[PDB]
Amino acid sequence: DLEDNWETLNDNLKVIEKADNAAQVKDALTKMRAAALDASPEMKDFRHGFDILVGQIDDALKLANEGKVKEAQAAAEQLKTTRNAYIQKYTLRVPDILALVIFAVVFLVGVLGNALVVWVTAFEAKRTINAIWFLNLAVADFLSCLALPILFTSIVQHHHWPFGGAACSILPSLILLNMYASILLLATISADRFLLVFKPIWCQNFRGAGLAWIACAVAWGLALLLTIPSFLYRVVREEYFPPKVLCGVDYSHDKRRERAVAIVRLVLGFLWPLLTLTICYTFILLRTWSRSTKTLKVVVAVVASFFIFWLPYQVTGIMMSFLEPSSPTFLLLKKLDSLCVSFAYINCCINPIIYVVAGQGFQSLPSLLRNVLT
């Protein structure tokens, strides 16, 4: 418990920063004292630093024991500074590492895969509707995938963000854009499937490239409009101990707005689509099983993959929104945020994988994709 004592220290430090009464301050300072005490000419110096730390903790503890909450918290701020000098004098979380691995593989597979898919569907885009659909999906996923290397770099550098406020606003939002764009596109495609099965005459009367392209345009516009509100609430914050730059969201003094965003994102981005699409393909699959399945199964697989890979993000998000920022579970989930987002990001590379698998179940790669997406 080398890193763990320090983790308890910073966690309880944030607890003191967000303390309700003197009692919580005292308890947190007690845990900090225990963790600081729990932790050669170099060993004498690190132990010296730990001693100064424990001393300041005891001072703050005296203050808390008196009844001066604010003053004890001030002493704790100073504690943060000295702790910073002592730690800077002398590791990354497992979930962040998993997030790095996932980000990497999703980047490779997403970039190469969706570049190949775009290449393939581009030939037949204005000749076949399915090509339009798959093209739009691939473009969404790829565009989202372009943001990954910078996120990777930032995570490797312990959340440090040297790319500016604008980039901080736009690049991390691209995955959300990918979510909405994906779900709207998929919804339109699902409508198309339904009509192909139950109202074919409409399809003989309506279907042209134009309607598909318009539907795509509206899907994209709506996705952008659904993405901008969160985009505007992205802000950078400079940390002074140790010096670095953080990129994040800012719902400060507006917890209700945070909850609102979490809820709206859950409903419009997951639950409503789950309901409607499940109804849709219940219809379609029951009819089919009572009687083009090659493409249909692919579409179904993609739809399922959406919810499969978005589920943890949504769960952790909502739960986090209903938790106090000073609660241990909240801090845990906060630490798990990047991993959940990576798991969500798997959606931006899973499509070419599905296409390749179905194609293999049909037995060159672009030729195979041509045959699958047509």
């Binding site: 959340h159 991390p172 995955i175 953080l246 969201v249 987002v341």
Partner: peptide, 6 residues
């Protein structure tokens, strides 16, 4: 404030 996405 919260770094990242949430």
């Amino acid at each position: 404030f919260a770094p990242x996405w949430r």
